[PDB]
């Protein structure tokens, strides 16, 4: 026996209205409501759709679970300074209130008139928390756009730390039409512990971040995909299709259980 309503009574629930937890951290037009909220269990609706620029996340499974298990959506505003470039590039596929907008937590760079010189900027972390930086690399659908946006045929993105380094040179190719845009973005992540530094260096094709996140690891936070909505009853246990409020330790309902719940 199970209830058809999710009840948060002691736990902390967040309704991901039109936003997957990954697009929620990027700052898509529909994901303004989620920003600035902690949670123990994030409900991810299967009706969540893409709204902004078409993109793809290598190792998407890791970034999804890491963002989930921390339970903190607070964003630290860190002022980056970019040299001899034009920032705040917007897109038409990413429409926010019918104004040509971009990711609320990201920054798109383009050359100004005649050049895109070598960028060299660092931010050493000495805080009492680990920092998560979310950045992307833009792939032009034509070689001609590669010189109009970034004034370089061999673009490059090299985001390094004290232990790792990831050098990516974008590949140019025509992708199928996704909201009238044949260009894709590859998003990567790099975690910086206290006493570690993060370096940014790009001769072209960078989706720069407007800051970083706060990381509280080894904390109880998880995610769940379901269509059942939230109710108003009292329970510490939630399953794949409802809440369970029984005392019998053996209940045959589901295998996905969160909390102090009776076994299979």
């Amino acid at each position: 026996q199970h209830l058809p309503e999710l009840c948060p009574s002691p736990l902390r629930l967040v309704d991901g209205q039109t936003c997957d937890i990954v697009n929620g951290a990027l700052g898509s037009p529909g994901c303004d409501h989620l920003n600035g909220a902690e949670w123990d269990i994030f409900i991810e609706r299967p009706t969540a759709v893409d709204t902004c620029y078409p993109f793809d996340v290598p190792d998407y499974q890791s970034l999804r679970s890491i963002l989930a298990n921390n339970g903190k959506f607070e964003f630290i505003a860190e002022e980056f300074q970019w040299s001899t470039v034009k920032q705040n590039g917007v897109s038409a596929s990413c429409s926010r209130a019918n104004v040509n907008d971009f990711f609320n937590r990201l920054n798109w760079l383009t050359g100004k008139n005649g050049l895109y010189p070598l960028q060299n900027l660092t931010k050493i972390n000495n805080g009492d928390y680990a920092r998560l930086y979310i950045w992307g690399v833009h792939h032009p659908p034509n070689i001609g756009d590669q010189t109009n946006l970034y004034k370089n045929n061999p673009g490059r993105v090299t985001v390094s730390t004290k232990t790792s380094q990831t050098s990516v040179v974008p590949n140019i190719g025509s992708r199928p039409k996704v909201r009238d845009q044949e260009g894709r973005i590859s998003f990567y992540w790099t975690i910086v512990e206290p006493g570690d530094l993060i370096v940014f260096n790009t001769i072209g094709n960078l989706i720069a971040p407007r800051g970083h996140y706060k990381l509280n690891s080894q904390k109880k936070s998880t995610i769940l995909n379901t269509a059942v909505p939230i109710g108003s009853c009292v329970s510490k246990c939630h399953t794949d299709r409802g809440s369970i409020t029984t005392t019998k330790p053996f209940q045959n309902i589901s295998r996905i259980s969160i909390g102090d719940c009776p076994k299979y």
């Epitope: 040509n100 008139n113 833009h138 009238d180 845009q181």
Partner: antibody, heavy 133, light 108 residues
Framework: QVQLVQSGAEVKKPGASVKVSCKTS????????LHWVRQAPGQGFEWMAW????????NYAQKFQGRVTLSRDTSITTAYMELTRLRSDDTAVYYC??????????????????????????WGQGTTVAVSG | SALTQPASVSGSPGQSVTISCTGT?????????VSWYQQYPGKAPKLIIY???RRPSGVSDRFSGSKSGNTASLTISGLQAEDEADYYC????????FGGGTKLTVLG
């Protein structure tokens, strides 16, 4: 090779209306702004208004707000500039010029945040307009 | 919105000529990135330097501009040969501002 063609010289009696056409070639007409500026005999240049070829947005000067009116044609790149209620004062060589700033990239869907002025790199050959009663 | 220029500049061939540019209080001191032009008699003007110091494809290295506080200058250091023309200047002060214009005279 970039060139700007302007309509021929015209003479109007005061109080009439004038319409000048500028036809671009060799560049994407919708990827740049468009300016209109006049130069009086023995005088300097004086800017009037700009127009957005991709959206049709316009912004006039106070001296010409209510008389001038711009228009754009997506096919064949011809821009226009109609001035109503002209007077004997307005005797000048009217120029059409493209701004250097690129604002849109249609394949990659990119757009510039706002507009900044840097320079008018291409100018039309000029339309000599005479207004005498 | 003034962007005042000298009325004339006289110079001997082989030397350099400087044409300065000044406006009013904080009108030109606005992240200058100024532009310049060269207009021959009875001809359309051409853009010679944009962003104060950079040249486009075609202008020889003889044309140059520099930052001097509130003043912006232009130097023509080559053997002047056909530089006799009216030189104008333009910046942005709410609505793109134009200078009066300076005529260069080749010596004879």
């Amino acid at each position: 090779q970039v060139q700007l063609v302007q309509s021929g010289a015209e003479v109007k009696k005061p109080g009439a209306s004038v319409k000048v056409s500028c036809k671009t070639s060799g560049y994407t007409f919708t990827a740049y702004y468009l300016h209109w500026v006049r130069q009086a005999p023995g005088q300097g240049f004086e800017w009037m208004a700009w127009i957005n070829p991709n959206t049709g947005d316009t912004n006039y000067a106070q001296k010409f707000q209510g008389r001038v009116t711009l228009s754009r044609d997506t096919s064949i790149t011809t821009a226009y500039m109609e001035l109503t209620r002209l007077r004997s004062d307005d005797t000048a060589v009217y120029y059409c010029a493209k701004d250097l700033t690129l604002m849109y990239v249609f394949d990659s869907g990119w757009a510039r945040g706002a507009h900044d002025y840097y320079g008018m790199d291409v100018w039309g050959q000029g339309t000599t307009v005479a207004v005498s009663g | 919105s003034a962007l005042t220029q000298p009325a004339s500049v006289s110079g001997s061939p082989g030397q350099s000529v400087t044409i300065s540019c000044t406006g009013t209080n904080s009108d030109v001191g606005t992240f200058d990135l100024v532009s310049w032009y060269q207009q021959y008699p009875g001809k359309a003007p051409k853009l010679i330097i944009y962003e104060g110091s950079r040249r486009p494809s075609g202008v020889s290295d003889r044309f140059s501009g520099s930052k001097s506080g509130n003043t912006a200058s232009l130097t023509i250091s080559g053997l002047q040969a056909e530089d006799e023309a009216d030189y104008y200047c333009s910046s942005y002060a709410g609505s793109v501002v134009f200078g009066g214009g300076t005529k260069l005279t080749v010596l004879g």
